[PDB]
């Protein structure tokens, strides 16, 4: 592709860590500063990172990546402390590039407002679905805040991956809810296996709760 004009120079998008990563200490939460519309001619990006206004120096610098539209995408990843993020510290990425008149600064932190504990409810298949060869196990998660949350499924100590989960939906009291749907072969349900919806959120005890569901 012939290079675009890029009159405005590059643009910056700053992304939060995955909810699960901030919640499990064995995991590594990262903030990601992405810079796009970097031109072939002025391709160098300089990153400065600040946590609550104090500079830090541990950022990792990724190799630029050629895009189809003949620009670079250029990224810096900063690993964060679990408690800093959850405590509402502000992460600032500052981006400097020759095509720009001044640096671009973007900041990100956890949504503000009183955290609220999710209620987790498992719902078995409809009598009506039981004529299909696969059935839907439903996990309803409601009344949470912030919207950052992770949901997985398990059975007999093993992960169950055949699931889809809706985005958080703002409910009418200012909290969020979502549904996760695990599809399993009916025979597995008929055998009496126990399936479990696992939910991770900052306002749950140990950041973790699990609700189970089986043939009754």
């Amino acid at each position: 592709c012939p290079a675009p004009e890029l009159l405005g120079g590059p643009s910056v998008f700053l992304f939060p860590p995955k909810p699960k990563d901030t919640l499990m200490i064995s995991r590594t939460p990262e903030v990601t500063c992405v810079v796009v519309d970097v031109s072939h001619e002025d391709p160098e990006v300089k990153f400065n990172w600040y946590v609550d206004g104090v500079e830090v120096h541990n950022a990792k610098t990724k190799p630029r990546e050629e895009q189809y539209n003949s620009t670079y995408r250029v990224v810096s990843v900063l690993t964060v402390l679990h408690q800093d993020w959850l405590n509402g510290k502000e992460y600032k990425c500052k981006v400097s590039n020759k095509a720009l008149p001044a640096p671009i600064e973007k900041t990100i932190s956890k949504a503000k407002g009183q955290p609220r504990e999710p209620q987790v409810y498992t719902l078995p298949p409809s009598r009506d679905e039981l004529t299909k060869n696969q059935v839907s196990l439903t996990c309803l998660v409601k009344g949470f805040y912030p919207s950052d949350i992770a949901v997985e499924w398990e059975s007999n100590g093993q992960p169950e991956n055949n699931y889809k989960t809706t985005p958080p939906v703002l409910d009418s009291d200012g909290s969020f809810f979502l549904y996760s749907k695990l599809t399993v072969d009916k025979s597995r349900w008929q055998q009496g296996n126990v399936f479990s919806c696992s939910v991770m959120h900052e306002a749950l005890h140990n950041h973790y709760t699990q609700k189970s569901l089986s043939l009754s």
């Binding site: 009159l7 405005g8 120079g9 643009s11 008149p101 001044a102």
Partner: protein, 160 residues
């Protein structure tokens, strides 16, 4: 008796980094010093923030000129005017100057947070006949490519 006065070409005293300026003496003092050249006019090819400050001038036949302040700004956009105080019925000439004269489109001049004039392509906003209603804080904004940019505000005051 014969004093001196400085004149800027173009007339804008607020400029953007990388802007060309030309100062007219009617020897040069930058922040009260000297210069590499005591020619007739001091030429700045590509301003930087250090070029800001106070300029006076003086010639073999003429005394030390008045103080003339040059502000060099950093940004995508700068709202230029010949000055910021006007008499009723005065003409107000505003220019939404983009960094490096980069093409700017869908331009709005705002007064007190409200769009006052819109242009498809960058044009100056010329008010021929100032009134008291013209007082307030102005800025401009527009698109450079797909990027939406705005100038800092400036306060305009109209006197009777």
């Amino acid at each position: 008796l014969p004093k001196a006065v400085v004149f800027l070409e173009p007339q804008w005293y607020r400029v953007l980094e990388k802007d060309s300026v030309t100062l007219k003496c009617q020897q040069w003092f930058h922040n009260e010093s000297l210069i590499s050249s005591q020619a007739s006019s001091y030429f700045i090819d590509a301003a930087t923030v250090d070029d800001s400050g106070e300029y006076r001038c003086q010639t073999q036949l003429s005394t030390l000129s008045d103080p003339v302040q040059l502000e060099v700004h950093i940004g995508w956009l700068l709202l230029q005017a010949p000055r910021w105080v006007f008499k009723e019925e005065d003409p107000i000439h505003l220019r939404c100057h983009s960094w490096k004269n980069t093409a700017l489109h869908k331009v709005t001049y705002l007064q007190n947070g409200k769009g006052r004039k819109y242009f498809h392509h960058n044009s100056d906003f010329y008010i021929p006949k100032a009134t008291l209603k013209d007082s307030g804080s102005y800025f401009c904004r527009g698109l450079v490519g797909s990027k939406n940019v705005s100038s800092e505000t400036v306060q305009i005051t109209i006197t009777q």
